[model samples]
Target: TYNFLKEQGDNRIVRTQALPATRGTVSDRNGAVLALSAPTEELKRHYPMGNLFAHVIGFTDIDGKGQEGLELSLEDSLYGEDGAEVVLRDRQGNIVDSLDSPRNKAPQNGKDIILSLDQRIQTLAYEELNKAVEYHQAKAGTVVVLDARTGEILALANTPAYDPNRPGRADSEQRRNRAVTDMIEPGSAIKPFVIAKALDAGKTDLNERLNTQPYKIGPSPVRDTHVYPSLDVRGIMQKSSNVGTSKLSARFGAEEMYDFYHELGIGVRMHSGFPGETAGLLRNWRRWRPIEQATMSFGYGLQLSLLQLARAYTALTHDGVLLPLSFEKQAVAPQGKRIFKESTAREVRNLMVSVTEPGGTGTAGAVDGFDVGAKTGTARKNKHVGTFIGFAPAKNPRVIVAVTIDEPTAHGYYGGVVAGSPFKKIMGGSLNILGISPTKPLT
Candidate 1:
């Protein structure tokens, strides 16, 4: 019955048929199939979430091989051994049909992979970040949500994303994952660390007062958007007062500050094996420039990815234990780097919680039925960026969410508005999805 023998001139057949091996399936935490192979000759890779899960799940090539993201990272485990069957076609065209013997060697399919991502949370983060990017007319944006206790990444979404189902896209910008790859000056988002260090060293107390009047470090002047006669440690973080944080740096050594930053993984790559992860920029504290020290206090002269920043904040959310983050689900908690004292973390948490309250810099980050601890950042470098990162139900935090809006043109460039609403949505929705009841008691 085999007609290939009749077309002798086109001897494309080697007298064998291939029994294709099935590629492994990739599912989310809740068993939602994120990636699956089609039952076809090509064995196409399909992403049901399309653009929503593009940056995280990645895509495969026509050869059923890993190309990017987890596909490339776990290539060795995902690509199983293929099998083949040998057969003979009748000459003169067809009669010597021999039973397949190589059929005994069955193809071994690849193993399935379960990621830590929650599809519901990922959807909320994507939708919220998309609306923010369009509202601010921004160039790009990223949102990363992590489990406060476990450090498992619940969601990682990026703007200017591409549809994984539709491939061969040449635009590098669309294919890029901004959440882990893009590094930006965190600006005031870094204020909490500076304050935490000060508190830890016994150099200052929460009630320590600083004159909010305009101050100067070397040639550059440090100013706060809101002018106040005086503000305490808590007020400084709440107002995101550059002048106040600069004063704190004046007494603190560059080595001490950089040490804290290093513990937070500022200069190190997350080492999650995700594609194109950046370690971010952090210079040595050896060079003694007065201005450098002051600016670094308010998130300048250095940079970090949104993922690194989120990992760092775990110290604040989880009582001084900065957890090691993971893209894969972990049943046991890992021993993370500790950057602050448990008492220090608790004090900073209280201060950060006020940053999202009324009269604070990030009022937009406030969520109903929850007490959220947060910090806002607005910085100008190659471009303008606004960011808000925090944990919700501050009393018993369950999740840590970070939102960064890159190069917003309008609709307010400050983090409070540009990045805050998305934090509210992402944090609020995450609470319900994870079944974390509100921990804040009735006021």
Candidate 2:
């Protein structure tokens, strides 16, 4: 009876209490807070930027568990180990005394995670995309800005954003990170890669003119918006001539074209570890028909994520090195894989410059103080999806921006109009935010 009474008394007095460790803070490259933990009655995950960072930082659940985006992907690193301490309790269940014990462990705080994102650019890009989407009454839109020299993702914004603080109030549609998750035919945006590869392989030359008249590939005929009897590779890119691109593609074997595109990251996983990211579609060259090869030259037979397209453009700006895109801040840029020669990449960039010159398809996207190199695309699928991907300071690019607006219903529907206007705003604003000097006199 004495032993049983002693055990019962010990159980009543002694209690093991949990010491919850603080979750780590998520910040932008400049220490702007994206996410943090609030010491409420219970620990709460807080997002100060709210909807501004919803799709990127994501939100935690009621139990403080990661539910989406970076919060979910980096959960293991963001969560800390809970500690425990042995204590004496009073009859009211209040702590009375602390006990020194070998079993006691201190809580380990989580490591703070810093992303390469710039808050100013992110906000600016989102505002531009939101305005475009709202004005055009588009289904949705996405914008991505990257540091071409380092491959750091400066800003990634999706339209129809939701508040991470109240994720439950929004539907899954508004919560999707379209830049990483969605795949769409690149349309004319694929032309730069094609031209670059062709130049690299000597399949075509900058001065070699091709017949830009409509040409048949199997039963489907490849045509351009305006018929040009003859155009050089530079003119082809400037006009976004489907016929010219198709003619040049005929010089490449299916295997060669497929290999080039595969190396460019089409149908290949970006290995970003982003949740639900798609590898996209690139069919084997051996299985491709003549029409497929011709169509692929202008970005119809294959598709890729917008992020993938942005990453691929790095080759042009980084002197032919295909730098990997990164969400986390990079201390130094990865060595990067070489996909083209410096000469070929620079030449392609020069040719792309014509795309923003007078009479170019992307003239609407030209920034006042910078010489722009961009490609515009409009995918026709009952509805129009307009896309613009480009770099700035044509001679030496520091930034690359990609924008896609899905199904714009008002004003104009062409890629140059629907997507280019917003691309101009985001790109110009990003350059200004970075304090990059203008290459030319401001208009």
Candidate 3:
């Protein structure tokens, strides 16, 4: 057994010097190169989009080996089959060229992988996020944009990001893709899920009145970070009231709530084919103490990858159907499972829209001519993970984006002030790029 283990470990270090000089290039649907392998004194791969699409395309190792992201997941497809041709020399001194039997068929080159990513949209997202990081002097940040109807990942950008061309300069934290890897408290972003769950169960109404004031749950005091006098369901979302969400969660009971969360794809592997994907922590319902339940309702006591958080929001944007998020384009819309009634989904969408109105928490998320909608999340990162997730063109949505700034050391830590402005810019620019006209009257 010891020898077997040692042999297996040694296989990883058995470098193959007979490998080909070059591998295939990766491109977007429109034929833009995202990852390219070029032959030098030695083979090298370059990522033109750099940190913009790092987590999606991934990078190669010093030995020209594929690492994470699509490089790892789609290795067989990207690398292609290995083969060789052989020739025989005539015996001795009066050598004559002779054709020998073919030992193996030549390996076919790898096919060009075309991702669903829109180059223009990805560039816009990266630029906007870079601007935000600079303006706020944030420690690190990431943004992921998804096509609502198709479930395609249009853009995924991260700041404090690394240049794959220069791996030596990449810090440890910069190499992390917070969008699908890091699990953090999502603050008010979790409110929509709880509300959707309640509405689906027929336990709450859109106009239901809930006390917006500070309330205690099992010896733990839960209150709105921002004070509000009274709130209805709509008001709770707009104000992002902790108390309101907590009350709604209590009505459903912890067990039912956990089931609802599971249905929405939280705390489970999403099968998106991305490497290092984490199934965020979700405790059993029976073990839920009152404080745990209350905190979980308002985006505490529970942690989720940014992708998980974004997927849950699909219940609202996608008419209660949660579709699988993908980096590849599909000819037809991917099938989804409905977690809420259509009516409930519509209600949640409407409430989320109010969150970007003049008096709401996400007012900063509004764009000039677009019918924008969003929610802000400003949970104190237990050392890392500050998040913001929202969607735009509220009435008939097109895009949803989630941002997380790790260990931000900026002017303000609120998701609204720190991340919302860039979210608006990126979404607006992406709309223009996609030829999506603004809903509001042109200025």
Candidate 4:
């Protein structure tokens, strides 16, 4: 079968043949040349987003076929309908004129797409995430920022990224947008969802105390890398108590827990329309044994893309409402579904704030002049995952940034240490760019 397809040119390597000119140039909302079609026989099309926007804007084939990104997703919108025109040529071949009073239908150009992304914020996120990868010399890194109220992805950057203009020169992994497509165990980042579900189901309380110690699940004994005293529900999240979260998961029961995960957009295909998109893995509770349920609480025994994790956090930030994540700028207010009670969301937000306070793990994630709330997780890499996903301007939240550094080779592996600082810097800069002045009194 393989030989037959290759022989028939079905598996032929398609290359973009350079034409004198391109159909047109695709620009950002502000008329920036994100992807431009130029006249060139030797050079390929110029894609400004390059590796930075590869996952977001995708690419086109040599034949000008849409391969991925907004090009593939919004093909009709980006490349308008083609039209025809009639013309006449003189006998000398030097003079030309339109036939029948220049009856011609001009081609309608693609509509300009306005992204919800703030270019400055996007640039900052890319710089910070890139710095982390370079500073620690990590294998790879990914960072995604979202608007909590609208669920709009402000910035999504992945390290080892490639330039779309020089796509042929980059590796396969570099072209992939790890933010929405890459899969990994969320580790402690998933704990908040578990606890939120427990609270929603009336199985737990914000103030409820839990006997959090080393918990043994079947053959696996879940222990916190950072040993702390007994933790209550608030303490569980404050300290990122893995043992405590696992206990809470057990209390919620497997079936109900799965339902909560589903509602939170885990294991479900988000309607982003991006290529190579995978719905994070979630198993049926009926197939799970006792240990699996316990493990799922602290972000193990399950896998999720970064986008899924960001979506789950929406319930915490947006009054327990889950809104669809959008890359395009929203003209109307987003309609959100209430997943948790407003009170529950408020309580969770309060706990999240503590995570950025003086004694919290994400102390470094805090901005000096703003009320920032965040959570940090440092799980074993091959055996665990480390993550820092949080939002800032606690009073009137403006931006929510999530940073995940995969398999860091460093002494400190905590999310607060590895990912939190960048989050604060990005958020603080983003706030300032948006003209959000600091409400705190100057030191």
Q: Candidate 2, residues 73-166: lDDT per residue as tens digits?
A: 9888898888999877767887766777887999998889999999999999989999999999999999999998999999999987898888
TM-score of each: 0.91, 0.96, 0.89, 0.86
Give, for candidate 3, the lowest lDDT window spanning 10 residues.
Answer: 8-17
TM-score of 3: 0.89
Error of 3 at 225 (Å): 3.3
Model 1, residue 362: distance off in Å is: 0.8
Give Cα distance to truth, residue 95, candidate 4, Å. Answer: 7.0
Cα lDDT tens digits for candidate 3, 1-443: 43212332322222212335356688886888899877777567888777668777877788666786788787777776555443222233222222243453455665567888988888888888888888777877788888877688888877667777776777777777777787777777888888777777877886678767887765778887677878888888888888888888888777788887777777788888888888887889899988888888888877788888777777678887888887877777789887778888877887888888887888878877876667787777535445667876777788888877666576777788788878878878877887888778875
| Weakest 10 consecutive residues of candidate 1 by summed lDDT | 4-13
Q: What shift in Å separates residue 242 of candidate 3 from its native position after superposition?
A: 1.3
lDDT of 4 at 307: 83
TM-score of 2: 0.96
Q: Whole-model lDDT, candidate 1?
A: 0.84
Question: Cα RMSD for candidate 4?
Answer: 8.2
Alpha-carbon shift of residue 365 in model 1 (angstroms) = 0.9
Q: Write the per-residue lDDT of candidate 4 for residues 297-342, one digit (tens) a residue.
A: 8777788888878877777788888888888778754888899898
The positional error of residue 360 in candidate 2, measured at the CA in angstroms, is: 0.9
Query: Looking at candidate 3, what is the lDDT of residue 397?
Result: 80
- Runs in model 3 deviating more than 4 A are 1-22, 88-99, 102-104, 226-229, 382-385
Compare candidates 1 and 2 on TM-score and give the better one: 2
Better of 1 and 4 by lDDT: 1
